[PDB]
Ligand binder design. Structure first.
Ligand code: SF4
Ligand code: SF4
Ligand code: K
Ligand code: ZN
Lengths: 124, 89, 556, 88, 57, 115
């Protein structure tokens, strides 16, 4: 509605639609970066006059497929090891210190972790 | 005194000389001692002094309507400087 | 040989628990761990602020993030220097994070304009955007330190920019060409027909000297003399006066502070007025027998002072008591007058009181030392005084001018701008000074221009261009000559060299780049004969770029 | 130095007059590069955001060895230039 | 070394002239210079001598 | 190996006077082929026009002084003669050679963008 489409936000107040061709992505309306040019603005160009908007490339936004994934938990330890969760075809191994009391994402995958005790506190 | 209070044409006075060397010996003397006389009597006439390293003495004043006439004072005495500045107006 | 194992030993030890974060490191391309684990090593095998993106996971320690804090800086105006000191990416800058890589950035050597020090800095750009500013070494002025204000106001040039001419039609500016803008000024110029004192010109803190000189010629050919900066000097002519250079310059310069004994703070907050020099005093204050006395509004400092009080009458008993006796005893005494003096009601009392103590002794002024100095805070005041761009009559400052042409001027709230006057603002931001305007002419950011600036020590430092001006903006002075043809007051300057040619007639020091022409001991004493509350509210709202900077919005 | 070698280098007329070359020192050797153009040095392409340019000397840097060697070259080609003395 | 890598002019076809004409250089994307992040340290030293002893003082 | 038509050995001439006579003959050689350049390249300008442009070319740079730089200017001008007479340059290059080309006040340059 000419307000969120051209503004960057953490989430979307409205429920997105897969069939709206003015959204930034099928699964998200507002862009996920301050410098990212809104899709509604870009499609208002000379070269989209006769080109069909339906067939244009609209990959699903990354910043949503991660937040659907439930947060991983660690039991009786304060170091989280993540190396892509795929074997030797992943990101370099990183160790995540769990001293802080919230969900700390991985360096590359974006996966979030926790401890055994703070499982009830972080989920709040 | 005499002709020290310059007329209303004189709206900017610039004094350029060398800090070191011997060429700017006389120009320093004239401005060092005679400065207070014009200054108090000509309250709205700026007295600009911009020093340099070895450049010859040079004094040029700005008239009305943004006009200046270049004047040189290289090698004069300590009293003939006043004479040269009298002739501007 | 045997020695090489030492490099292969320390290198192996450091890379033991180190994270494998090189692709995701903010400064992964220039850390002195990689470049020193290659040449010398083997081959096989919380948060502290909204400014420093701390990650101690990447530390190698050495406590250089600790040793510097308790030595130089000591809620710290200089804590951002820790970013440039830690070699590894343990402490990286937050505003710049994840935005650029060192192998791509183009570097230019230029100067700061936020304060009157004009410290040498290095700017790392990317095309038509400035990414980060880093300090470039200069022992004469700064020596590797720049305050958080300078290096975190970079993004202030990416918003609020004036990119087009603007014209007022009602109460809202509209987008209008340069042809109409240069005519709407001249069209309305003769509608009101200003008289000799009905034309006013105000020069801002960030206005360069080429515009300052070139504006006078345009002003003079239209017959006006209501020209000065956007200060609040109660005395209409400057109390020090633009007559002699020594009246308003750091005759000692910065490289003559570490060899001082007694320092006088004439109503100033050096922590908030010059951060680079504030630590310089703190560095001396640690090992030396330095004695500094506070005369002015009370404040909080990294170091204690020989505090006296808060009033002017505190200084009356200073130069005659033991406070001024040590000034006589000092082989190289220091007197510093801040930019907050001329603003005060008793500014005239300041110069007569002190210069009487500088015309009395002889050890203060030696063939190698000058005990009296000024500490201004703007980068255009000294340039104004060295060119005589100031008025010399209270009557002229009282005129209800019909045509006020602003040139970078912002602090004009206490300036009585008549409501009916014709106000034209030329600048590079939309801020306080912009609202008052009628026809706006976009200028240039200091990085986008070759502007010759003069610092508070009298040093003439220019700038090398980094990026083109945004939108259709032009150079600062080029508008004035362009505006000259539209008023019949055309200036004979047709290229930037000729603008420097005009500076030759102004003074000989203006054409000496990085060269300071001092005041001779045989004349500076004559300039002494002429004489015979902290000025800053918000540290992060001082100049135009800081106010419009999204980063400083995290400093409040 | 006295030779008008610009008639044999084939360089365009604009290099002799309208361009300025800086002789700087980044820590043991000196370099020459041309100062940026007033306008048209870098404009954002409206298609894909490419950093377009009309300056053909933007990518050129000459690595020299000694200061006087660089000055000899600049005078030989008839180039306008200025020298930036590094800070000690 | 002073000759720019992109040259001074490039050609195109101008329909009105009905011929292929030279024109001043224009780049939609300028040649990005990545030498700025070069090595600031020393890489290689003197090395090990191999001069045959018959060709020494 | 057999050198091509209108070839000369590249020689470092060590006389001021000999270079003067070499150039003078060369200028006549261009004028002798004035008719050919029109017919070979199908130029739109008549024979007198080419001679006028050739004269504008030769008049332009007659005041050079350095003999070491005299030979270089004579060497390359020989190549221009050899390329043109042997009909080596394409038609378009000659047409554009003669088709190349007062300034404007500061206000005019300030408004549009100058340089
Ligand atoms: S500091 Fe250097 S070695 Fe350590 S993770 Fe960052 S780039 Fe890699
Ligand atoms: S300065 Fe950097 S390397 Fe040194 S102790 Fe601090 S974080 Fe570790
Ligand atoms: K670092
Ligand atoms: Zn991971």
């Amino acid at each position: 509605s000419t307000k969120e489409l051209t503004t960057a936000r953490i989430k979307d107040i409205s429920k997105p639609d897969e069939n709206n061709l003015q959204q930034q992505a099928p699964n998200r309306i507002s862009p996920w970066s301050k410098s990212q040019k809104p899709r509604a603005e870009a499609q208002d160009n000379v070269r989209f006059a006769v080109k069909d908007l339906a067939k244009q490339p609209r990959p699903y936004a990354a910043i949503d497929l991660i937040y659907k994934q439930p947060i991983r938990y660690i039991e009786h330890d304060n170091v989280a090891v993540c190396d892509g969760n795929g074997g030797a075809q992943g990101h370099p191994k990183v160790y995540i210190n769990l001293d802080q009391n919230k969900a700390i994402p991985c360096g590359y995958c974006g996966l979030r972790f926790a401890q055994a005790a703070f499982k009830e506190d972080i989920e709040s | 005194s005499s002709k020290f209070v310059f007329p209303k044409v004189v709206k900017e006075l610039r004094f350029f000389l060398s800090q070191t060397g011997e060429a700017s010996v006389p120009l320093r003397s004239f401005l060092t001692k005679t400065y207070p006389a014009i200054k108090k009597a000509n309250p709205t006439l700026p007295i600009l002094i911009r020093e340099a390293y070895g450049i010859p003495p040079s004094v040029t004043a700005r008239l009305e309507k943004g006009h200046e006439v270049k004047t040189n004072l290289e090698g004069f005495s300590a009293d003939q400087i006043a004479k040269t500045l009298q002739s501007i107006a | 040989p045997k020695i090489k194992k030492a490099r292969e030993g320390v290198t192996e030890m450091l890379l033991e628990n180190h994270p494998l974060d090189c692709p995701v490191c903010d400064q992964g391309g220039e850390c002195d761990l990689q470049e020193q684990s290659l040449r010398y090593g083997s081959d096989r095998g919380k948060a502290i602020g909204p400014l420093i993106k701390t990650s101690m996971n990447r530390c190698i320690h050495c406590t250089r993030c600790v040793r510097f804090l308790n030595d130089v800086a000591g809620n710290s105006e200089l804590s951002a220097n820790v970013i440039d000191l830690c070699p590894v990416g343990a402490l990286t800058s937050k505003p710049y994070a994840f935005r650029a890589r060192p192998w791509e950035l183009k570097r230019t050597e230029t100067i700061d304009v936020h304060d009157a020090l004009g410290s040498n800095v290095r700017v790392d750009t990317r095309g038509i955007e400035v990414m980060r500013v880093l300090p470039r070494l200069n022992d004469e002025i700064n020596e590797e330190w720049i305050s958080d204000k300078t290096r975190f106001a970079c993004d202030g040039l990416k918003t609020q920019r004036l990119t087009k001419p603007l014209i007022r039609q009602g109460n809202t500016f509209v987008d209008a060409t340069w042809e109409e803008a240069l005519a709407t000024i001249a069209e309305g110029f003769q509608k009101v027909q200003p008289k000799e004192n009905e034309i006013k010109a105000i020069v801002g803190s960030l206005t360069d000297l080429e515009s300052i000189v070139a504006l006078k010629d345009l002003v003079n050919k239209l017959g006006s003399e209501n020209v000065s900066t956007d200060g609040d000097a109660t005395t209409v002519p400057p109390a020090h006066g633009a007559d002699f250079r020594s009246n308003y310059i750091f005759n000692s310069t910065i490289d003559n502070i570490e060899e001082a004994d007694q320092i006088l703070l004439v109503g100033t907050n050096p922590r908030h007025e010059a951060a680079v020099l504030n630590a310089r005093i703190r560095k001396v204050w640690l090992r030396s027998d330095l004695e500094v006395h506070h005369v002015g509004e009370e404040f909080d400092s990294t170091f204690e002072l020989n505090h006296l009080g808060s009033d002017v009458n505190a200084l009356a008993k200073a130069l005659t008591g033991e406070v001024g006796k040590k000034l006589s005893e000092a082989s190289k005494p220091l007197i510093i007058i801040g930019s907050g003096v001329t603003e005060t009601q008793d500014a005239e009392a300041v110069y007569a009181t002190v210069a009487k103590f500088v015309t009395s002794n002889a050890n203060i002024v030696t063939p190698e030392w000058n005990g009296f100095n000024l500490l201004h805070r703007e980068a255009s005041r000294v340039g104004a005084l060295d060119v005589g761009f100031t008025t010399q009559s209270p009557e002229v400052a009282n005129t209800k001018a019909k045509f006020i042409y602003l040139l970078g001027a912002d602090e004009i709230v206490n300036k009585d701008i008549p409501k009916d006057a014709f106000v034209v603002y030329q600048g590079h931001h939309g801020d306080l000074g912009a609202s008052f305007a009628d026809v706006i002419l976009p200028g240039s950011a200091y990085t986008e221009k070759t502007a010759t600036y003069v610092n508070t020590e009298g040093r003439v430092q220019s700038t090398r261009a980094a990026t083109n001006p945004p939108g259709v903006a032009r150079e600062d002075w080029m508008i004035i000559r362009a505006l000259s043809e539209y008023l019949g007051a055309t200036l004979p300057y047709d290229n930037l060299y000729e603008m420097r040619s005009r500076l030759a007639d102004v003074a000989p020091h203006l054409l000496r780049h990085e060269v300071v022409e001092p005041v001779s001991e045989g004349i500076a004493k004559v300039g002494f004969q002429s004489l015979v509350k902290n000025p800053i509210e918000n540290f992060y709202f001082t100049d135009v770029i800081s106010k419009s900077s999204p980063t400083m919005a995290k400093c409040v | 130095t006295d030779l008008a070698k610009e008639l044999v280098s084939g360089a365009p007329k604009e290099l002799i007059t309208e361009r300025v070359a800086r002789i700087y020192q980044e820590t043991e050797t000196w370099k020459i590069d041309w100062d940026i153009l007033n306008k048209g040095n870098r404009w954002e392409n409206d298609l894909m955001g490419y950093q377009s340019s009309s300056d053909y000397m933007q990518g050129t840097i000459l690595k020299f060895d000694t200061r006087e060697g660089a000055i000899r070259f600049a005078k030989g080609q008839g180039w306008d230039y200025y020298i930036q003395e590094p800070k000690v | 070394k002073d000759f720019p890598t992109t040259g001074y002019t490039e050609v195109r076809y101008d329909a009105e002239k009905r011929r292929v004409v030279y024109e001043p250089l224009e780049l939609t994307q300028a040649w990005r210079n990545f030498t700025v992040g070069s090595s600031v340290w020393e890489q290689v030293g003197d090395g090990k001598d191999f001069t045959p002893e018959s060709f020494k003082l | 190996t057999n050198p091509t038509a209108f070839a000369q050995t590249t020689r470092y001439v060590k006389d001021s006077t000999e270079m003067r006579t070499l150039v003078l003959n060369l200028y006549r050689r261009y004028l002798r082929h004035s008719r050919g350049f029109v017919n070979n390249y199908n130029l739109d300008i008549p024979a007198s026009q080419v001679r006028t442009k050739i004269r504008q070319e030769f008049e332009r740079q007659r005041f050079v002084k350095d003999l070491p730089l005299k030979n270089v200017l004579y060497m390359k001008a020989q190549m221009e003669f050899q390329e043109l007479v042997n009909f080596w340059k394409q038609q378009c290059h000659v047409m554009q050679y003669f088709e190349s080309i007062k300034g404007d006040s500061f206000v005019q340059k300030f408004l549009k963008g100058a340089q």
